[PDB]
Paper text:
The first step in genome replication, the binding of the Origin Recognition Complex (ORC) at origins of DNA replication, triggers a series of highly coordinated steps leading to the assembly of pre-replicative complexes (pre-RCs) in a process that involves CDC6 binding to ORC. ORC and CDC6 then function as an ATP-dependent assembler that first recruits a ring-shaped MCM2-7 hexamer with bound Cdt1 to DNA, and then loads a second MCM2-7 hexamer in a head-to-head orientation, whereby this double hexamer is topologically linked to double-stranded DNA (reviewed in [O'Donnell et al., 2013; Siddiqui et al., 2013; Bell and Labib, 2016]). Here, we report the structure of human ORC in a functionally active, ATP-hydrolysis ready state, providing insight into ATP-dependent protein loading as well as DNA and CDC6 binding. The structure of HsORC reveals a remarkable similarity between two very different ATPases: the replication initiator ORC-CDC6 ATPase and the replication fork DNA polymerase clamp loader.
Residue numbers in the entry:
A (entry chain A): 490 to 606, 614 to 661, 674 to 698, 705 to 735, 746 to 861
B (entry chain E): 8 to 81, 95 to 244, 251 to 268, 299 to 328, 349 to 433
C (entry chain C): 41 to 83, 97 to 164, 188 to 506, 548 to 606, 628 to 657, 676 to 709
D (entry chain D): 17 to 142, 152 to 239, 244 to 388, 398 to 432
E (entry chain B): 284 to 466, 471 to 574
Write the structure that this text describes.
Amino acid sequence: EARLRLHVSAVPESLPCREQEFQDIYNFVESKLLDHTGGCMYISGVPGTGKTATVHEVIRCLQQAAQANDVPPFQYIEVNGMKLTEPHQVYVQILQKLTGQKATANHAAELLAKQFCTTVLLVDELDILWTHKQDIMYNLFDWPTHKEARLVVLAIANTMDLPERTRMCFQPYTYSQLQQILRSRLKHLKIQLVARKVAALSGDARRCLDICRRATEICEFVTIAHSMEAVDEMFSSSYITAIKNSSVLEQSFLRAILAEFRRSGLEEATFQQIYSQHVALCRMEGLPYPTMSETMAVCSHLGSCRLLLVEPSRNDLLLRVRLNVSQDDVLYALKDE
Amino acid sequence: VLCRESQVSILQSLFGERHHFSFPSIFIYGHTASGKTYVTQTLLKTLELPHVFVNCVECFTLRLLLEQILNKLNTCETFNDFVRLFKQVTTAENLKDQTVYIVLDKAEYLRDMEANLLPGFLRLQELADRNVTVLFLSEIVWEKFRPNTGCFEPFVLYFPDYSIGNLQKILSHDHPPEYSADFYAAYINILLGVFYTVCRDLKELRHLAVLNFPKYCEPVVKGERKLWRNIEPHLKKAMQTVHVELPYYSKFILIAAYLASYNPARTDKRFFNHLLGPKPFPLDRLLAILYSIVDSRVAPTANIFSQITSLVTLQLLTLVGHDDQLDGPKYKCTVSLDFIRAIARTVNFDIIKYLYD
Amino acid sequence: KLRFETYQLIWQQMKSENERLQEELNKNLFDNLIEFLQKSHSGLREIPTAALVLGVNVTDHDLTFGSLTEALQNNVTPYVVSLQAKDCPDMKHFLQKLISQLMDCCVDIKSYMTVTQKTDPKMLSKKRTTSSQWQSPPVVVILKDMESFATKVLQDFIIISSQHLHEFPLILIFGIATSPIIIHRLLPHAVSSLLCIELFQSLSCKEHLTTVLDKLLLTTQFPFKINEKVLQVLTNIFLYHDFSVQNFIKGLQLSLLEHFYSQPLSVLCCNLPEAKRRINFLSNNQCENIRRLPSFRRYVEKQASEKQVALLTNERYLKEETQLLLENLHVYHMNYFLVLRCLHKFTSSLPKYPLGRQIRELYCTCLEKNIWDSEEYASVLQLLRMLAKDELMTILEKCFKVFKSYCENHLGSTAKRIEEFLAQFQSLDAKFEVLRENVVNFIDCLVREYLLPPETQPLHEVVYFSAAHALREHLNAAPRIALHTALNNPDICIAYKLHLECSRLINLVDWSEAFATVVIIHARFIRAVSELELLGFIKPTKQKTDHVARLTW
Amino acid sequence: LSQVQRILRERFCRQSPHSNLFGVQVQYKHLSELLKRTALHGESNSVLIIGPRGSGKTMLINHALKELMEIEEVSENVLQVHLNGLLQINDKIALKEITRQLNLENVVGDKVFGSFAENLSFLLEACPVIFILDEFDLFAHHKNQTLLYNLFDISQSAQTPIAVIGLTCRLDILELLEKRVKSRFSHRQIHLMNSFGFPQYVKIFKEQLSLPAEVFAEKWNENVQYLSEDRSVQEVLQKHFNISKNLRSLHMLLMLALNRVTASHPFMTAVDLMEASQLCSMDSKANIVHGLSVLEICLIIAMKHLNDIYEEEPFNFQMVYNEFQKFVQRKAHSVYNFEKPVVMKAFEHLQQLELIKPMEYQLMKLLLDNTQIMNALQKYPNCPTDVRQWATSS
Amino acid sequence: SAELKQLNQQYEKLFHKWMLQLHLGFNIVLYGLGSKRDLLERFRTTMLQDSIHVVINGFFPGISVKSVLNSITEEVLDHMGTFRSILDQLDWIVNKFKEDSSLELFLLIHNLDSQMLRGEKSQQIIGQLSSLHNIYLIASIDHLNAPLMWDHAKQSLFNWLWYETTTYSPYTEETSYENSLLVSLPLSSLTHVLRSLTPNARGIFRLLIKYQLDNQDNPSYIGLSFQDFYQQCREAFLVNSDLTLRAQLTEFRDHKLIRTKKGTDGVEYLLIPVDNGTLTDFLEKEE
Ligand SMILES: Nc1ncnc2c1ncn2[C@@H]1O[C@H](COP(=O)(O)OP(=O)(O)OP(=O)(O)O)[C@@H](O)[C@H]1O
Ligand SMILES: Nc1ncnc2c1ncn2[C@@H]1O[C@H](COP(=O)(O)OP(=O)(O)OP(=O)(O)O)[C@@H](O)[C@H]1O
Ligand SMILES: Nc1ncnc2c1ncn2[C@@H]1O[C@H](COP(=O)(O)OP(=O)(O)OP(=O)(O)O)[C@@H](O)[C@H]1O
Ligand SMILES: [Mg+2]
Ligand SMILES: [Mg+2]
């Protein structure tokens, strides 16, 4: 249970290492809350930057403050866009969390309009609420600006351009910031040459905890060598691996592709042209003739694993073939030996 | 069944014992008349293995195709999700332990239906784990069925075309109704000796074998060997084989249109590639050529423009741009030239003289 | 007006006998549709079919598809359905109407929101309603246009229905104009065989034309007759333009009526007693009117005295002499037709047909100008004097088996000349005999009995209708004659002169300025030209900057 | 007896749950490891098994899952849910399919929950579950990816024991996931299957044909080991190896040669496998050409001449008809001369066979390789000397 | 001034006759040189008169076949606005008419040529209606291709009585709607200057127009500088050099197709001294 207790600490965690962002959001809600007014704040960032976690923290703190009467009471509501099949179910959620309970999306939206013509509403990943007419976004952002509406809106998504089609952004995590979170809870061990090794990344936090959690799995069955192995089992590109393990005729077919490309110089060629090249190579390697039924199989083996991008098999000799891997990568996979 | 004996040994031994397992999928290719399903149905009927047989062109949708397969086992069925559900739920002392066969005929039409349907069937054995064998047979090579993400590759079995000898042995000796089978043999040997190089379909050869048999043996009952001389010109009559009344100004519009089709562009000055097709007409050009060739010079009436509109409506003429029929017509003549010659012969005008060739 | 009571009388008598004779010309072909269909029903995966060739007439035959729905619901044999091709873009509407129509073919004779139909319930109606009939019904699926069938759709049904078959021995009738090659075009060879067709024939417009003229307009029943010019213009709209007996009929009403608004002088147009009633009703204005027209004025010119004024002043001796004009008149016309048919079996047999072929032709050319004065007639003479022998004795003996058949059945007269001819030809059956019969056909008939329209009795007007031109304005639809000749022959007149003059394309710099070299002054050419757009003698064209260029030639 | 057949048939055709695991020793450790961690402890993980098709995945996960549930605590406390992208094409179908496999059908339908996640969470809360997603590629293609996102979202933040194990053949899989789902996926836990060495292939060949401990089996295995080394079987196995490097393709080869074994042919021979190999090596499109009528052939030779004249430009029936007419012109008499409708019937039959493709007034291009044509002509049974001379004219 | 009235009077004698024709199921037609307004509106004041006379002017772009069937069905018919599918519309109006008999409705169309009436659906409507006996049709035509668009089925559905009807009157209210180009440098002189230049020169001019028109409502837009317009032209591949764009703007300025105004900054700003209506019309012609 020594280095095994370090397993238990990776999957979720607390408390935040985003110190400055937290304060900004707290003061935003506190400002709007103290005044008995509404507002909206859009939060950008990379998927791993601690946006929803920080918000949840700010909420728990504001509820504590609401118990001592430091800040006005009370209610809070959260809904996730990716948790719904059909965007319009949002109106049901919001209403169901408030009074009035169940109703259709049409009747709910009408009711929310009535209520809004204090409450904190978190809409996490409203990128999913995009619709042709975008009525729901227009409503969520219009509601807090009504006189009779006291509503504070916190909108999270991954892109800065969303509101362009009262704002904040979470930058990706740096060398030191990631290094911080890992040792931040290693307190079982107060092994730390690794925490900085894994810490060079782009830019998610989940990568760190999941990577190092795998490193411990390597150790048992932690040094820097264990983490290099951990990363090489994850971020390592599988394409070059597959080309090395591909069969004989599969490689000759790639050589055929590279031959046709070096002739034309384009990124597309037809199975017919590639076929002529493949015949030439099989002739020069002492191989048997590449029966077109075989070569079609091969070309599908390489298109099933996405080494190739191939037109549907119905087109027969007119298949147009693109490489899903850069020519330099293939030459390196074939020529390494 | 004859001349397929080799394919029967392969396909029979593959079936093995009925409580065994067989290929998850088998794919037979060949031509229309190869005899594929005749062999499949016999083997399934004779042994007798439980099976179902379904035509993929008859059932275009999932509901129809899947409901047929489910019903024929002895049932509202939308998606392949519920087939494995309700096929797996179909088990009894009849089907409990045994190999079940599903023959999808003309599977070539599965390609056009539902993306996940052909893959689901190739792997259907392990999807329901019910000891199934899906039998695909189509005239299309397996190389054209493969999808992007792939599939479980079936066993590709080739049913070869019948030779001229395989045809006679199948076609001849199995119905010598009123005579010695040697007489009917020499008959068929002559039948193929004509029609083989054109029609290799066993189905159609059986027709002609029945059709022309009476005339072949007619000299026998009338008291007159070597009848090859008798029917050969009659057979060759069938080999290479097996009056529209129009108004005057209409005929002239039509033949003018054809003359506009054949001769093109700046030849109108002198006058007034054939395998490629017919050219386009501006209505003005057609009226010009018409009044040029008419040599009666009748003024235009609504009925005449109605005549040309009626002509295009009858599909004797066709315009690429249907929408633009009054703004500039690009009409195109379809018929010709024999019909044009007939129009010329009846009218007495000559089509050939104006043809630039 | 009385002439409209006569209209509806004649009119619905006409479309009546037209639709009945449509039903008989059917009846050989329809008795051969149910005799063919009952020959194939007398004697797998193959749809037999029936191919009917109806040349290029649309609406006249929808009657007989209503009557195939009826008649082939009547034999107790099928329950018939008709699929139209334009109804029919997709593969769904044919199987939907397939079955809608054989569950429905079970309904109409007993005396949902139609989205509800699909490909199942036909297979059920000759299963569920009757799977065991036992004798299967045909459903002749009348494919009224198979030519416009969508070809993909076409083979998908002939293959789907063919595949399904012999549970449904469908036959399907083909409404068609052309010959078999075009079916063999739009219906592929696989279909040409799956159809197992036996080619059938249906009668076209031009036959119904010549028939109906021989019968109807040239009947002696109705007095109304037509002048050379609206006969020529009509049979020109029929032969040279539009082949529908529809447009010839509606044009024949419009002729009927058109005349029948001419003047009351036709109230005497009726049977001699029906006309003479009107004689009694005649008043002094009309007495003025008969005093006026020619062939009366001509009839007044070769004549007498106080006799002549009791035509002109004292009406009684006229109205007596009207019963003299008219009695004769309706005598003459009978004396013609009896004799016109006569001519036909003579010369309709003949070659060169220089004077004419079909009965309508002889009526036409005979009435146009003097047969005698025409030399093509004399040519026909030389012919008959040539043929002689047994061709003539057979055809002439058929002129009496058949024309004595007319005066035995078709015509009552009884004119006493007919009888003399008749005896003459009996005697022959038992050259200058052929030339005294033809000279009898010459002096005794063509000279005498066949004679012209204008050489005829008094009052050949109003029974024979002049004034062709206005109808041609009201039917032939010749706007560009009046337009062309009007715009040619004055600022828009001169404008169209310029629009004729300049070159081909006329630049609005030096068109506005050439029209200012050649010609308030501008606005009328932009309205001339904007009309010439609206009229269409030019177009507002972009082939060059600021240009106006004609599509019309 | 036929006892041989019953065994190899469940091994070759159906996929034998128990067999020898070749070269997966590393990958099995990582999978079985993770599986203990989610089942025995309260940990939640997600992993992808990624290889070519026909090798690896489904047997690995099947073998791993079996050994896992042989632990008494596991079999009682652990539920497993098997999903497949072919069967469930919609995340709503999948939801109701999870509800079905969890025996949670007693919800029952009275409460339709306000959100997709709320319904999924409500199911797990009614205690680990192992989610197997087969054909993971297709689950990535569902609209907004609700099933993947919310499974990973539940796998990470919900602390409900769950195991999300995907199977895919796509090296491109990771690029098919949304940024959000890619993050929540326990990052790039990846097992790769791929291939082996030729000597390992032969050892596999002999191991799959051999029979287990079940004197009849001992005599059988001696003969297999004899086959393992032969100049014939080896030069055939290599030819298949240079293509396959796959145990499923091998299974097919062993199966077809297994029909050759009967009560009159007790054990396989070199010829049994050579014949079985010949059936697989056939060129399908060459077989189809062999059965055409001489008319259709002459048309293809016309099309061949058209691609060699007009330089690979498409063509229509007319120009084919012309070039074909030039062929019969040689002799004044009519031998191959037929009516245009008939020639088009055969032409349309080539299209009906998809030996010609469109893009008469329609342009089309020939789908045959010239070496297929010249080889087929030499192998055609009755081919007349006249069409052969014409073929080489170009 | 004298003649026309007499002719507009003569046609009036056919009028009652047309009424009878209207009873018999045919529909009269006027092919004139001029307008029948005084004659068709005298047909409204003399013959039609009565009630149930529907008037839709086809030279009016305003009325539409859907709003033709509304304009018939909304006010005069009074039953309803015609339902979405016009075939269903006519099925309701007809199940009213087939049920309610002996209701004759006389409709007079000036210039069927339209649009909106160009649609084969529009004349399948007018084909059915004027085929439906209750109402009746008097159309006035101009377009030479008017007989063009009427097919067999429609000239059957329309049984047309065609009349000399050679009319001399304008074409005043018919002429009030049509606009022509004679009504700053006018459009056609602009086109005439620009047609002798290169394709890229015309492209440059169209780009500068576009900038002028998009900003025309902003008083603070004084135009583009040469460096800005030169970058914009480079990005559109209209000009690759300073020298060629400067030469092109000078050639424009000699024709009076650009004017420069010094900004506050001493920089020359490029405007076009042509009415923005004329420039708008130019861009609508060039595509
Ligand atoms: N500073 C941190 N300390 C501890 N854990 C962290 C930190 N930052 C991120 N995490 C990890 O990230 C998760 C919190 O989610 P996060 O706030 O990144 O959601 P999100 O950014 O809204 O999701 P997405 O951006 O993908 O929509 C936690 O479960 C934790 O494992
Ligand atoms: N050996 C044979 N003996 C007798 N008839 C045969 C033989 N082979 C084929 N036939 C004919 O072919 C028919 C069998 O159809 P066949 O087996 O060719 O269908 P199929 O090949 O499955 O059809 P398709 O290939 O068009 O799907 C029989 O009804 C018979 O007419
Ligand atoms: N390393 C191996 N160990 C055992 N069997 C193997 C191995 N590699 C391949 N096979 C055989 O190949 C077949 C592969 O089946 P499996 O479904 O497990 O993977 P797969 O075919 O790639 O799955 P998919 O359906 O995604 O293609 C099995 O029948 C198995 O017996
Ligand atoms: Mg979030
Ligand atoms: Mg698998």
